[PDB]
Symmetry: C2
Subunit: 357 residues, 2 copies
């Protein structure tokens, strides 16, 4: 059995990984060694204790990886580094994992001698898990995206802030909501007044999220005009698919909405050729066992294609599939997927399973 | 002075109209006659009293219009019908108003003898107020839209449901949020559990909105696969611009999010010709006095381009302006606008002002 080290297993992403691993009994397949950054278990900074392991799985973050990874590689360590952080995604000796989509790229990398496997961007990996069949069959020319991102991608304190903001908004008009006769405009004026107040908690977001939205995620990239999160659409979709020689354009706007764990995305996909709707539905459905084609009907979309339904599950529903008014080569698609699972911990758990097998 | 009748002035849209008219002292320029549907002030069903007026302004709704309008027209009535409802929009003797955008179309209709003026679709009106300059200079080939719609477009009870939903979500984890050391995963499990519960109020939406989203607005139109709200993009943008002979494709997905009265929209605009970014910003900015070009910077986007900022104001900010990866002919734009104002009561108030002058 492989001796595997775990760092950042107590954080949010790390906790989801521990729970998923426990659920699938992944621990009876390896020898787990747990690390801690605390001085109050082995030290996550002890390069010699980390050198003894076959595989290192980290959910600690970029600031840790950027400190520890180069120091450990400097000792001659030929083991595997599995990372949930973004820090190493864009290095040449690193492959971005999402096995139901890029199993061939990972298999070629294990053969080539790649020792660093990093999980992908949440929105990009959730997009590929949904619309993956179109990429396999080379039907994608370009994709325009508009995201509906949850607070979890920004962190734990961010989820708490959103909930606190939601509560303070209702509390502001609690008495008025009780009587069915009260003025709706008055209620609105009071909720907007509370949203705008000095004591309204906006420290983690820098703006109100509950009852609103924030059309900006991460630092600006002056060269393209994109934000770091928006840039990961072009950069990562092509790195995951091994298409760095023939880059398919994926660009759009990344917006933060008041949801807890699920990222939703609206797509305008330009197909290379004109195909029937019934065929496109079967091509999407056949790619993997997690994707779910939701028929363009009201009651079923309301019940299936929402964060309410998908939260805490591995299911990746895709729906609102129809041809757009620009041409029969323009497809409309809307998807919903859990950020902490396929967008964070699940591709990490799955590459580990392959490595310890 | 013109004798003007007001129907549905106590509803939500009608109340915003009364407030705006009062704020602009519009009552000093006309003779107001108020109608009611109540049997507990003139009757909104008394065709003879309605026949005496020069103009009828209604925010009552489609079920009123469809009953009263044909009856009153059958008596030989020469006056004007100004409607906030959707009922008459697609009729040949009716023009869809939004004067900062279609003043020429309205003037030509007054000189042609058109007697019915109907306010337009909220999302379409808010889009045209934002990027009107691009339609003026005939730079738009097609537009793909992804909307972030407020609860107000669905009505008063819907806004109340959203607020009640937000409240029950925080209340479910009230003491856990006060404790800075509590588990985030435990918190989300409880919030998701309450969102999923039987007693959680989802009556008006048919699904949870607070902490979630609903990617379906209005009835299915089996013909194109679009929803009735999505269809209004193609149909209404062209009727407002008088381009029913040469239709510019506007299509996309209409999604309901947890916002009160501001609709936000993400666009992928395909320009006919390749123009510089610094020039595209000036063209959008110079179209009308309400649009506001927000520079592509973080602190300013957070402060300006949000429902929190624009709610209850006539300001229509447009931002996140950049060239997309598909080519320099592809522009990205994000806009926010108050649904009750430019998307409902404001175009109605404005055509009335022109009619009574």
């Amino acid at each position: 059995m492989k001796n595997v080290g775990f760092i950042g297993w107590r954080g949010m992403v790390g906790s989801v990984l521990m729970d998923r691993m426990s659920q699938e009994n992944d621990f009876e397949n390896l020898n787990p060694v747990f690390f801690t950054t605390s001085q109050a278990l082995k030290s996550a900074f002890d390069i010699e204790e980390l050198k003894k392991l076959d595989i290192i799985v980290t959910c600690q973050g970029g600031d840790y990886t950027n400190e520890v990874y180069p120091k450990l590689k400097a000792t001659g360590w030929d083991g595997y580094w599995v990372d949930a952080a973004s820090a190493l995604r864009m290095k040449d000796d690193a492959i971005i994992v999402l096995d139901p989509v890029n199993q061939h790229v990972i298999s070629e990398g294990l053969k080539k001698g790649i020792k660093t496997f990093v999980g992908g961007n949440c929105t990009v990996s959730l997009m590929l898990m949904a619309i993956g069949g179109l990429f396999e069959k080379d039907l994608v020319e370009w994709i325009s995206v508009a995201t509906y991102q949850a607070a979890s991608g920004a962190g734990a304190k961010n989820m708490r802030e959103l909930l606190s903001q939601m509560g303070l908004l209702e509390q502001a008009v609690s008495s008025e909501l009780k009587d069915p006769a009260s003025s709706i405009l008055d209620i609105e004026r009071k909720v907007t007044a509370k949203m705008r107040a000095d004591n309204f908690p906006t420290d983690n977001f820098g703006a109100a999220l509950g009852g609103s939205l924030i059309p900006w995620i991460d630092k600006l990239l002056p060269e393209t005009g994109q934000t770091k999160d928006e840039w990961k659409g072009y950069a990562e979709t092509n790195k995951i698919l091994g298409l760095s020689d023939n880059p398919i354009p994926v660009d759009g706007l990344c917006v933060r909405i008041g949801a807890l764990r699920c990222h939703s995305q609206a797509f305008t996909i330009k197909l290379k050729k004109d195909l029937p709707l019934e065929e496109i539905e079967q091509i999407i459905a056949s790619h993997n066992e997690w994707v779910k084609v939701i028929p363009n009907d009201k009651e079923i979309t309301l019940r299936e294609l929402t964060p309410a339904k998908v939260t805490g599950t591995l299911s990746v529903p895709v729906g609102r599939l129809r041809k757009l008014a620009m041409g029969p080569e323009y497809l409309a698609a809307f998807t919903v997927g859990d950020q902490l699972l396929w967008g964070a911990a699940e591709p990490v758990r799955r590459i580990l399973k392959q490595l310890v097998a």
